[PDB]
Amino acid sequence: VNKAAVDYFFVELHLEAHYEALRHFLLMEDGEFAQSLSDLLFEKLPGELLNPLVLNSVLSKALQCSLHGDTPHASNLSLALKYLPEVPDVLSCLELRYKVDWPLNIVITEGCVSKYSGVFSFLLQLKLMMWALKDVCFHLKRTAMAGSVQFRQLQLFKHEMQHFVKVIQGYIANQILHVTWCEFRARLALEEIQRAHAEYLHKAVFRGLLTEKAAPVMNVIHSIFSLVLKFRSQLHPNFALMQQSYNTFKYYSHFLFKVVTKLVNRQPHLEDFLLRINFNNY
């Protein structure tokens, strides 16, 4: 029966495909998709952007710009929500759930997919920086004749704030997508499939600074992300109001390097972070 069950799947209708497909969509591994989904949603920002006429349709417009997908796997991307927002912050709650059928639902647990939604809302929140920060980099371009100390000293802040985001992202693009994927790909090749999958994702949420153990490391990240959003509000009528903001940024970043170091004595995953945030500095 089993030999006839597995054979029925290949020659007529791919567990190895579903994993390497959900990663293309949920974990945002496939570019030109997250850079097209998040880019659309961020163009708007209440009663709008919440009815099933825009957010249930922005996905069907997103997949066309993916250049990878549009397969039977590519469907079943219910872009639903789980909260009704009332009204500068760094939060926009929104889920993205995969869907499966019977002979595969018994392996991919209905709790494991729920944890993808946990790691997804973080990764999307990261894109909100590299777009808003890209905006001020593009918003300032049209300002160019106007060359003075007030101008050049201002733009050095962006290069100083962008680099911190482009390094914390480079970390995520190394742990949760490449090394944790090296395992569970050369690991597989029936009970084991449940545990191996329960160990693949669990390492993805562990190396992802979402675990409550290293939660204080995550709490400080919001202070960084918040100040960059304020920096986007002030798109030189109020230069000094921005000069104080950057000085708060350099303090918090200088505080992160100490709280991570003190948390080394008590986790080899965090070891690579200090080598990322610190390089020829203190």
């Binding site: 496939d30 990878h68 733009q155 050095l156 480079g170 693009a173 080598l275 390089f279």
Partner: protein, 370 residues
């Protein structure tokens, strides 16, 4: 977002041709611009296949090549000819512009070694900032009355081109005699086309980070002035082998001092578990030196080779040693200034570059701010 290229002078049309050969080889595209049987997004460079090329003598031999189905000596004269055909040539740009879905940038392949294109290059960049103010422009200029035409185009490239990849023929020929033993033009460009091809590895193949031309440039170039880059390409074997062979001055395509930002592109299927280890050994041995003021790091991203065609790697850097190359040029100018309608444009050109040479030397000080 679509990318379009422009090739000027004799040099640009030559290396751009081999650039089109090597790139057409990466995908399953026959020389006759037809896909053969035999993932890779081929829409950024090709338009249904038709390449978005704009070619401005050798053109006759280019059509005489099997790839036909794939489409004076002063500076002021090169600038005059660009004005005489102002509207005639520009229509090609516009019709290719809006006919495209969403233009992202403008790749410019040209030489500044006294050619009619060298002036021709100076004119286009002025108008490209006039008409389209929301379109990035990148230029893969190449370095060698030659002092004159060289220093002049530098006046335009420092305020129009938001990025630049320098390639000096001098440091190239050193690689030619040493590791190819040529002792020609079509011989050195074989390696040059290789640098440009791998330079867009993250664009033609989708990845997580850096999925657009603004994704690569925005990290390195800190200010609209310090906007000069150099390249490296080691395969001519683990990760610690690649990055260590890149930082050597024997491989750099350039003839205190420190780096501002590095970008290393790995194209192989290497085990990604060791990429952090190589980063540790490079730090501890202190093989490279960075700026003291701001926290400057080195970034690496992975991609996949063309399955049709071994571990390759590209190194992209913004080194303040590039200031020395200018000093070699402008020094020749003062010597030619004393040896030979207003001759005033040559003054402001010499003036503005000397501001740039001041801007580099000021970046290496721990108090670069203010």
């Amino acid at each position: 977002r679509e990318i379009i290229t422009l090739q000027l002078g004799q040099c640009g049309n030559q290396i751009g041709f081999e650039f089109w050969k090597q790139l057409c080889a990466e995908h399953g595209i026959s020389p006759e611009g037809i896909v053969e049987e035999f993932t890779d997004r081929k829409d950024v460079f090709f338009y249904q296949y038709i390449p978005r090329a704009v070619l401005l003598r050798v053109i006759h031999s280019i059509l005489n090549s099997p790839y036909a189905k794939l489409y004076g000596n002063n500076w002021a004269s090169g600038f005059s000819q660009g004005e005489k055909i102002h509207e005639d040539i520009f229509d090609i740009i516009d019709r290719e512009a809006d006919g495209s879905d969403s233009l992202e940038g403008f790749v410019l392949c040209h030489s500044i070694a006294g050619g009619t294109g060298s002036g021709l290059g100076s004119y286009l960049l002025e108008r490209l900032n006039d008409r389209y103010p929301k379109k990035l422009v990148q230029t893969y200029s190449v370095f060698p009355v030659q002092p004159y035409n060289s220093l002049l185009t530098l006046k335009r490239l420092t305020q129009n081109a938001d990025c630049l990849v320098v390639l000096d023929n001098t440091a190239l020929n050193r690689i030619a005699t040493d590791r190819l033993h040529i002792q020609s033009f079509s011989q050195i460009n074989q390696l040059v086309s290789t640098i440009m091809s791998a330079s867009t590895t993250t664009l033609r193949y989708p990845g997580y980070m850096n999925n657009d031309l603004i994704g690569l440039i925005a990290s390195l170039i800190p200010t609209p002035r310090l906007h000069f880059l150099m390249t490296g390409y080691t395969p001519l074997t683990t990760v610690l082998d690649v990055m260590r062979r890149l930082l050597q001055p024997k491989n750099v395509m350039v003839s205190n001092h420190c780096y501002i930002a590095i970008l290393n592109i790995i194209q192989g299927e290497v085990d990604p578990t060791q990429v952090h280890k190589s980063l540790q050994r490079i730090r501890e041995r202190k093989l490279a030196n960075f700026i003291p003021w701001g926290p400057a790091s080195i970034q690496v991203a992975l991609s996949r080779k063309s399955p049709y065609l071994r571990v390759s790697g590209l190194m992209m850097a913004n080194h303040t040693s590039i200031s020395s190359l200018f000093e070699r040029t402008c020094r020749q100018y003062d010597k030619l200034r004393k040896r030979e309608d207003n001759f005033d444009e040559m003054d402001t050109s010499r003036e503005i570059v000397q501001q740039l040479i001041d801007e580099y030397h000021a970046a290496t000080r721990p108090d670069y701010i203010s």
